[PDB]
Design an enzyme around this catalytic site. Structure first.
Site, PDB file in Angstrom:
ATOM      1  CB  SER A 116     -19.394  -9.805  33.563  1.00 54.36           C
ATOM      2  OG  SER A 116     -19.096  -9.344  32.256  1.00 54.36           O
ATOM      3  N   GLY A 159     -15.168 -17.945  34.886  1.00 56.89           N
ATOM      4  CA  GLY A 159     -13.910 -18.667  34.793  1.00 56.89           C
ATOM      5  C   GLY A 159     -13.949 -20.181  34.713  1.00 56.89           C
ATOM      6  N   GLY A 160     -14.842 -20.728  33.897  1.00 53.63           N
ATOM      7  CA  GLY A 160     -14.897 -22.171  33.778  1.00 53.63           C
ATOM      8  C   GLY A 160     -15.753 -22.890  34.798  1.00 53.63           C
ATOM      9  CE  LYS A 214     -13.333  -8.970  27.731  1.00 56.56           C
ATOM     10  NZ  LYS A 214     -13.640 -10.372  27.312  1.00 56.56           N
ATOM     11  CE  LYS A 249     -15.989 -10.605  32.504  1.00 60.31           C
ATOM     12  NZ  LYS A 249     -16.709 -10.596  31.197  1.00 60.31           N
ATOM     13  CG  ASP A 298     -16.503 -10.386  24.936  1.00 59.72           C
ATOM     14  OD1 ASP A 298     -17.268 -10.943  25.754  1.00 59.72           O
ATOM     15  OD2 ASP A 298     -15.289 -10.197  25.177  1.00 59.72           O
ATOM     16  NE  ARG A 337     -17.242 -22.820  31.324  1.00 60.94           N
ATOM     17  CZ  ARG A 337     -17.765 -23.992  31.680  1.00 60.94           C
ATOM     18  NH1 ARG A 337     -18.645 -24.603  30.894  1.00 60.94           N
ATOM     19  NH2 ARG A 337     -17.356 -24.592  32.792  1.00 60.94           N
ATOM     20  CD  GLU A 386     -12.103 -10.222  31.749  1.00 61.82           C
ATOM     21  OE1 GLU A 386     -12.557  -9.583  30.776  1.00 61.82           O
ATOM     22  OE2 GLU A 386     -12.249 -11.457  31.848  1.00 61.82           O
ATOM     23  CD  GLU A 411      -9.777 -15.168  33.312  1.00 62.01           C
ATOM     24  OE1 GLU A 411      -9.909 -14.652  32.189  1.00 62.01           O
ATOM     25  OE2 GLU A 411     -10.082 -16.352  33.545  1.00 62.01           O
ATOM     26  CE1 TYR A 428     -20.889 -40.270  17.387  1.00 57.96           C
ATOM     27  CE2 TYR A 428     -22.597 -39.327  18.789  1.00 57.96           C
ATOM     28  CZ  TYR A 428     -21.566 -39.162  17.884  1.00 57.96           C
ATOM     29  OH  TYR A 428     -21.218 -37.887  17.494  1.00 57.96           O
TER      30      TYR A 428
END
Lengths: 363, 363, 363, 363
Positions: free
Chosen positions: C300, C272-273, C146, C229, C33, C303, C187, C189, C363
């Site tokens: 849930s 959470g990361g 959510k 959550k 989302d 990332r 949620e 958080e 690079y």
């Protein structure tokens, strides 16, 4: 919500009349409710022993002062012991007080107890059997009561728990008093300890008082039948910033205007460590503050009315009249102060108070 | 917010160990904490004068029942007097209970007092000097305590004030107990009085428990070191609708699942006027409810464990063993019931012995 | 209190059925989302332009992954835009998810807004016209929603105001959703930002969750028809002390046990990361924690389920399969983790991560 | 707790200044903020079609009244549409208002929405993007806003949830307004619908207002920069007991004295269906009440200032002056009333016209 009147019109009238008499123009309260252990320290500083006789005599010295204090003293808060003692003339102290036109009050709390899970915060006990005690006290001449809650300003205090708990216990006490025809003095004292400035104290005072009044409402308390006994808004004792009394007055009145409904009959300030003159000067500036003040702003002083009296006495019965004189003078000074007519130039320039926390040593 | 640990890991472990010992599988609590006034009503019914000796004898009859009760009794709640009495063999009552593998508990509240401005609602007192009392009780053999708050369902009850006030006082009590190594039994009893249905009771119970747990959180209570003693969810005594034990069980377990955190070690139901068999059948059904129940669901019965014993006794010292037998039988029944193994011959639960309020006469 | 059933037995049934389907054994949620602003940064890190087609394609990549993800995904949270997009075969995304056995969810909040008078704290907006939106979303294939509230741990945060306001807004949102047959994922958080330790996070989590549940009770929320959550209990990102996953699991489970009632259907953790591997390992440890857990403990993840897929994708159509595989693998791993069956694979070298700042200049 | 100033001294100064201007001696507010749906009703009752031109004409009629109304109108509350409309002379309405010495206000709520689980109770929406809307409005000429919450008296209403929720949303709205230099009028309207008596209305008003001020304190609202818009304390519309204006005045002032802090700049009463004359007389009696009132007690009238102007107009431009005269008359009458200098002719006058109903016909 549904109404189930806690009080009848007759009961409301009695409570209101009592509350008004105590804070009538030019009148204040003599707080002489020090418990035996508290008064012991006071007597020791003057080299006097803590015996019931010296306590009775000392209380007699204040209570039997000449009629000049009559128009100044609206009420006297007594400790349990003193309520059942008699003056040399054979009259019980509560009678002496009433004959002089004052209302008799009684301290009903049983001290503070710590709140677990907090940083040295407390709540106050004394609710058990309070109803029956109030009934007996009423019968024995008392018309108003006092209950003291203590709150401290620190990095994490007052905590939400401390504020909610103390506000709730004050409301319970107030409720029980009104059921027995006794006017409750709500005392949510915020200690001046610390190095916090004037604004932090004003902020904390505003938050604490808002909680106090929401609780009183929740418990269906009759505001017209109560008196508030708060701390004046002042910087912390260790604060390094200088403030004029007009600033203290402005902050104090502003805090009260934002939280105390006008139905509250009066606000009787505790002097909390202030000297006698400082306490009169501050109360005077508070009453001179140009802001609209819908309630009586008077005094409920302990040490600020007794310091020079106790000193002059010093156990020597000989110094009776001279000691009483000191008290009569502070009573007169504060009587003028609660009317905004105490003369002085907002004095704080040479008459000292340990400003060591403002000097270079505080760095 | 900021933490200032109320309890150390050592104190937590002790409280947790105590709580678990009391509600170990198959174990419940004998509530023999009736005060002189209440015990009087009990003794009178059987024609025995309310004397210290008769109260001591009666308690002895219960406490000295044979070892068959040992696996059934995890704890015994006593009234102050009983904690300091001794059995005929010289042993102090607390020692007798402990030798039989039980934990000793003490009633510490000082009764309910009215809340002004409500429709006959109350709060409970007993906080004054509670810390010192708990410290003494602990030294004297007690490891858990009981405090009872009472609320009633009616047109305007329970009110927001009664809910908040009772939940707050329960939290204060719990806090003081935990500081003294005593496991507090939280008892928010909702009376069965009235003609309200099962759903009405379920609703009020859920609202009440939600308030209780929010208060315990606010006061920093260690849940694992507490026990809950609620009322089973039942219709009001004068309800005209008929319900099965499976319905009361579903409603009770549902109410608890929606409000009681899993950390709470156990739920010890009060009988609240139910007959001995009924209390056992309902508790059995509660334990056989398909829903997941994360806490021990046991008993904390007074009359439900003593009705037959007292009657059988009849004050006659000759009926001792018979009276004790009735008691042992009820303890065994509830032991099986708190494990969902109480299936009386025929695999079913008893029906209502009267139920006049469900007949045509209730119309 | 007085009941006015917010929901009918049939409505409760529907919500309960939906909540259970999402958190069925071995299933979790794919949080996809991300709003236009959020996913833009995701696309930018992989040198891809943020267009509607690129967003539609990336979303399709995840939603059409092979059948192996079917038993691992109980639900997918979509952003408004995605709910109305179609797969290359002319089938609406909601249809694709449902055909694969998943439930469709929609993020309904409108972001965080500052709370004046706080130290940078916020509340969340999105209530206006939420009822209408929900009714439409339900019509379009969405069964759950959510809403994200954000709290921060600092010296003075979260404040009582922030806790109260966020809990109340979550409760308003949950109420509106349930009225429209939509299961609300609550949620609250608590950001991992800061140098606070594990105990600090645990303390704060327990306090916020207790306020959240009190709020849900006050607003008459049907708990069985909701999902929680929360953040797992971990030290702050800037904390120097290294904690074991066993400690994190113990702290997380203990906090939930003390605040989340058994009636809550499931707890769907946010990563959470945390890295993909870290999130799976902690989720597994939580499920292996010896304490009793009466609710489903699953994921849930946003990332933590997409990092590798996004990377392996890079923006090239040819990489479609590569990216899908990475996602499938992560879904499988978490499906095992939410059952305590995950065998931590450890690490050597690299896999995937986020951002670029101090690496390969030329690079 | 700790402070984090929501406003700077300058911002507080502006807010206080605007608040004081609106409620200056002899001044009140014209509430012309009816939405398209509400205004449509009034137009229909006089045989006029609800069109933008007719709405613009009507509003212009009130706004362009002669200079005699200037000292009477401290502010005008407009609906979004009107704020951007122009008078026949090309000047935008906000300009017309400021030229006559008035302050421009804007209704910012988005109506009431039902609270699930209550007996038909509501809360109010309109918070989403409120800050941005306020910023725009301020820039476009508005200095104050109005948000209406509706509460209802009945058997189980207002409930705890409704009171807490409505008070919390008013606080949120007030906070956002103050951050954008807009003085918020806090309107907690308790509907006059029902057969309840005077005492019941007073009881409810006291509880609602206490909750309102506690919420305002919790959200850090600057009270000096606010106005309160409550209902007067009166019996329900269906109440059969007759009451005098003195009783209404005493009840109203008594309720305000017990809950509204002195810092609140002013109270602007809504008419609540009272006839034009009735509203003026009651307001006058309120200002005649011997009790001390530390705040301005004036009007913020909608129907009470437009009833006669509307019918005299009758949709005919020719009747313009007659209509404007009726308005000036009511405005002058209320200017005197808010100063306790109003006097009546003895009976009803040109105000009663519509009257109470009960399902007569929906229109």
């Amino acid at each position: 919500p549904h109404s189930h009147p806690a009080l009848t019109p007759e009961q409301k009238k009695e409570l209101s009349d009592i509350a008004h008499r105590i804070v009538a123009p030019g009148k204040g309260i003599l707080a002489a409710d020090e418990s035996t252990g508290s008064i012991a320290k006071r007597l020791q500083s003057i080299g006097t022993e803590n015996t019931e006789e010296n306590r009775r005599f000392y209380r007699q010295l204040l209570l039997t002062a000449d009629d000049r204090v009559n128009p100044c003293i609206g009420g006297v808060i007594l400790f349990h012991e003193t309520l059942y003692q008699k003056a040399d003339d054979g009259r019980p102290f509560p009678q002496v007080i009433k004959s002089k036109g004052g209302v008799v009050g009684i301290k009903v709390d049983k001290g503070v107890v710590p709140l677990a899970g907090t940083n040295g915060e407390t709540t106050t006990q004394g609710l058990d059997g309070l109803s029956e005690r109030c009934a007996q006290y009423k019968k024995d001449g008392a018309d108003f009561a006092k209950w003291r809650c203590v709150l401290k300003i620190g990095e994490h205090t007052p905590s939400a728990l401390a504020i909610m708990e103390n506000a709730n216990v004050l409301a319970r006490y107030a409720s029980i008093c009104q059921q027995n025809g006794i006017v409750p003095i709500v005392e949510p004292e915020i200690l001046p300890d610390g190095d916090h400035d004037l604004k932090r104290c004003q902020y904390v005072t505003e938050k604490v008082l808002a909680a106090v009044y929401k609780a009183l409402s929740d418990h269906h308390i009759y505001l017209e039948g109560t008196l508030l006994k708060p701390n004046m808004v002042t910087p912390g004792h260790a604060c390094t910033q200088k403030y004029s009394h007009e600033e203290i007055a402005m902050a104090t009145v502003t805090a009260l205007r934002r939280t105390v409904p006008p139905a509250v009959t009066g606000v009787t300030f505790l002097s909390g460590g202030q000297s006698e003159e400082e306490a009169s000067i501050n109360l005077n500036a508070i009453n001179k503050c140009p802001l609209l003040k819908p309630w009586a702003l008077t005094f409920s002083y302990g040490r600020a009315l007794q310091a020079s009296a106790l000193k002059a006495w010093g156990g020597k019965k000989e110094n009776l009249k001279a000691a009483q004189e000191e008290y009569v003078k502070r009573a007169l000074a504060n009587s003028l102060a609660c009317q905004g007519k105490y003369t002085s130039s907002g004095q704080a320039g040479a008459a000292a108070s340990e400003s060591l926390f403002i000097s270079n040593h505080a760095y």
